[model samples]
Target: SLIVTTILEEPYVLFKKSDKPLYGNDRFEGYCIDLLRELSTILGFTYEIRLVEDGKYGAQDDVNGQWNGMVRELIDHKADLAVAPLAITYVREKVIDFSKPFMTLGISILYRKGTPIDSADDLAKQTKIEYGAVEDGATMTFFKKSKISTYDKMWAFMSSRRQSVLVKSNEEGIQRVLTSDYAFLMESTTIEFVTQRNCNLTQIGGLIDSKGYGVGTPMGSPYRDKITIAILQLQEEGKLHMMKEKWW
Candidate 1:
């Protein structure tokens, strides 16, 4: 059986009911789940899901190619593959190879409904806006880095910025933004999930960074070929769109 490592970042992967039968949960499903199912079909395998959780609020980790919390689980060989919203970072990529991108995404904002913070451009101009990001290896990191228009400057700004909230996970960032006036910069797919659910939240405008989601395999694994081919077949069959609509 294939062991798939994943994190519980909502709209991407969630369970409405702990006891719900496979594929029974409603909004708890979305892109990743659909991708998982299609992969099984094309690759001709049955797999089990191993849920991973982030450890640090917004810690930057590299060198060892590991992050705190559940990320270490994968790097430590606790799982065969990472099937969550694992951002494709150079450091992480050194330790693991990723499949073709399943979807395009970037950082976007979510604030209290009807708030003045409409976009990243608007967010930067205000002193009181108080915007925060998830963490290193996340799209928010790229968003912050992009503003300074250079990775070094962005890292410096992130290190020195006191007004930002460094959330442990994207889910935490969303909940924090929901209850507060702060603007959150997180994945577009995540914001898409939140906006589609909570009428109180809105994902406004473009992105802080431009990126895509891909399946992760331990570096040098042959499974990447099987998974990549599965992804292409799923797209051509229109199964990808159907799954997105049915689950998301």
Candidate 2:
């Protein structure tokens, strides 16, 4: 079976519990879970899905010059595929190939609803109100690589204050935003997901650093092209979102 390395993020890839323990593939169920199901229907290959061992979205550390998370899995061939909310970042694309974009996304902010930081510019002009993203997430890369003034300056604050600003997961960021004076940098899709669930949470700005999520495979995998074709076919049929409810 093809090994699929993914993350257990909500809506993207979470569980549907049963009264009893769920087995291998059955233990998985979410947007990625269902997308993989449809994917197999098109590609005719069954897969064994597993969460990324380190639970990161994958980032290359400047210190070690090595990668981690699902990207690392694909690079090392520990798994043949990576099917998460894996964005087609410039760094990642150079290492692994991506299929046609399954979803378009851009960096946005998650913060308390009545906050004064209503926009990215507003956020940049403040100091007491701290903002950050998942330490190893694509948004983190976006700021570091951005040429825009506001984002570039904001990057300094985050990088310099990495001790407290750069957090581990969306969940941690969400908790901080919920309880303190903070803003979490994340993709628009996830911000939308959070706003609906937490009335206290709201999106502070429009999309930035527009990117897309895709199926990831080893640098030269034959399956990569086929996956892109399947994604395009699914798109033509208006089936790419796979689960409209979760996306909603």
Candidate 3:
């Protein structure tokens, strides 16, 4: 049986009532759940899904150079697949295989409704309003790595405030935004999902950077081609769109 590692990122993966003691696929439901089910059907494999023990999506530790979260699970061969809203990036691609992107997204800001922060420049100009992003996110890495003039200055400003601005998770950043004069930078897809559920939170600013979400596997996994083919077939048949509509 395939062991799929996932994380509880709303709309993407969430817990739902089963009404009774349920087993296997019946125990959970959401976008990832449905995607895995259909892919299993197409590929003729039954799989078990479990949450990443570490809550993080995954990041490389700077000091020791070890990976954590879903990425670590795959690298360690503890999981056969990672079927979540995992972003595909250069650093991660160096360690694992990713299927063709299932969805494209970009970084954006989330803030309390009625906030004056409408754009990145607006955010930079203000001292009273505080803003932050996930510490381990690829978007954060982009800010640190990009040499473009706008992003370079933005990163310089942000990094100087890192001690006060960096957040542990999207949930923490969102909570701060809701309860205080703060803004959280995150993927636009997640901001869209959260803002739909909480009208008090809204996304501000255009995309900061664009990337794709992909299914992850251990490097050189033979399943990569098969899974990519299944995803393409589902996209052509519009089942992928149907799932997004049903969940998002």
Candidate 4:
């Protein structure tokens, strides 16, 4: 038996669309839903799906030195696996094992469709136009660690404008961009998924940083090997690529 944890991130996982209330696995749908179903069939395991209680993807708290979200669940043995759109990162890999990457992506800037902003430099040039990434997210981490002249300058500028520039979630950031002179820095995959549905929103510039999404298991869990093998087999058979297309 396995307890698979995930988040309500669109195109990856979301409440099932139905007039009547759905239950159990039927209550959700998306890439992860199909992926989990397929993996269960291939691996012969019975699993239960549950959303992250905190509604965050996952992040470490610098002040308290605690982890949150799906990663935290895995760390505490609350869940056996995390089959969400979780990104594979160095910090996260220190505590959890990730399956072979299923999708490659990067961070990008998201702004209102008609906004003139095109890059980090564009935001830097306009003091009145504010931009931000989700608080404690990988994109935010990237900005804090940036060393390039342009990115460093951009991060420094945004840091000074902290109160108005930091966002709690990508949804909040996107709403800000839609209604004000603001931009959102987020994953390209999410930006792409959002822009396709909301014509008013669009991504600006190329990738800010490259990364990949993978299924997460507790560190040293024997299931990690099995999960990786299943993911690799899906990739070789072209099922992984097809699933992404089906969702996107």
lDDT (C-alpha) at residue 136 in model 2: 69
Superposed Cα deviation of residue 58, candidate 1 (Å): 11
| Model 4 residue 203 lDDT score | 88
Instruction: Count the clashes in each prediction.
Output: 2, 0, 0, 0
Tens digits of per-residue lDDT, candidate 2, 56-167, equal 7778988988999899999999998899889998889999999989888888888887756778888887888999988868888888888999999899889999989999
Q: What tens-digit string does per-residue lDDT give for candidate 1 at 128-246? A: 65666765656555654454634444345445673456665677777777677667767777787778888888887777567767888766778888888888888788887787677
- lDDT (Cα) of model 3: 0.87
- Candidate 4 global CA lDDT score: 0.87
Give Cα-based local distance difference scores for all models: 0.66, 0.87, 0.87, 0.87
Q: Estimate, for each residue in 120-166, the C-alpha lDDT of model 3 and write its tens digit.
A: 77876666787778887787888889887766766777788888888
Instruction: Name the regions of candidate 4 deviating beyond 4 angstroms.
Output: 114-116
Candidate 4 residue pairs that clash: none
Prediction RMSDs, each to the true structure: 4.0, 1.3, 1.8, 1.6
Model 2 misplacement above 4 A: none
lDDT of 2 at 92: 92
Clash-forming residue pairs, model 1: 57-167, 57-168
lDDT at 28, model 1: 47
On residues 54-88, what C-alpha lDDT tens digit does candidate 4 reach at each position?
98777899799799999999999999999987889
